Amino acid sequence: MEMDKRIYLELRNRTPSDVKELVLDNCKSIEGKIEGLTDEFEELEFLSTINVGLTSISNLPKLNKLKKLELSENRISGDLEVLAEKCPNLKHLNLSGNKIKDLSTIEPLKKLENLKSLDLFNCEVTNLNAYRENVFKLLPQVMYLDGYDRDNKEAPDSDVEGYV
Numbered sequence: 001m002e003m004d005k006r007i008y009l010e011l012r013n014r015t016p017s018d019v020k021e022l023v024l025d026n027c028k029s030i031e032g033k034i035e036g037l038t039d040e041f042e043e044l045e046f047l048s049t050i051n052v053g054l055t056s057i058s059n060l061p062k063l064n065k066l067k068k069l070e071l072s073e074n075r076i077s078g079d080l081e082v083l084a085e086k087c088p089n090l091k092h093l094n095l096s097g098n099k100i101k102d103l104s105t106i107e108p109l110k111k112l113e114n115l116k117s118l119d120l121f122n123c124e125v126t127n128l129n130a131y132r133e134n135v136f137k138l139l140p141q142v143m144y145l146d147g148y149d150r151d152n153k154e155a156p157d158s159d160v161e162g163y164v
Contacts, residue, residue: 007036021046072096
């Protein structure tokens with residue numbers, strides 16, 4: 001079952017509008033098209049595409065209820081400017097192992113004022129000095145980067161009740 005059929009299999013259990021989370025994990029794509037991810041996904045919040053061979057994300061539908069997009073382990077070397085349209089509500093984006101090597105590539109992300117957390121694990125920006133500090137210079141929305149916030153604290157899951 002290819003990328004589209006992986007999606008199709010789940011869409012059989014529930015229609016795109018009812019799919020809150022659907023992951024394409026290590027699934028061979030059609031070619032360079034997702035196909036299955038249409039803007040029929042009303043309440044699609046969590047989605048991952050771990051190692052599916054996506055070089056460009058110019059196949060994204062306008063998911064206005066999105067929350068988490070894992071694009072980790074893909075040949076993403078740009079084409080992020082499409083996110084301003086398809087993801088004007090996304091706060092969580094994983095670029096783990098993606099070919100985002102320069103701060104110029106993350107500039108389109110400043111258009112997404114909802115972004116709160118970025119994952120740069122094994123991302124190409126690791127070859128940059130003070131990569132976190134430089135990201136906060138451009139992207140002023142994200143509060144968390146690689147698990148640590150602006151205070152250099154690991155994102156508290158319980159002990160964040162206005163105290164430290």
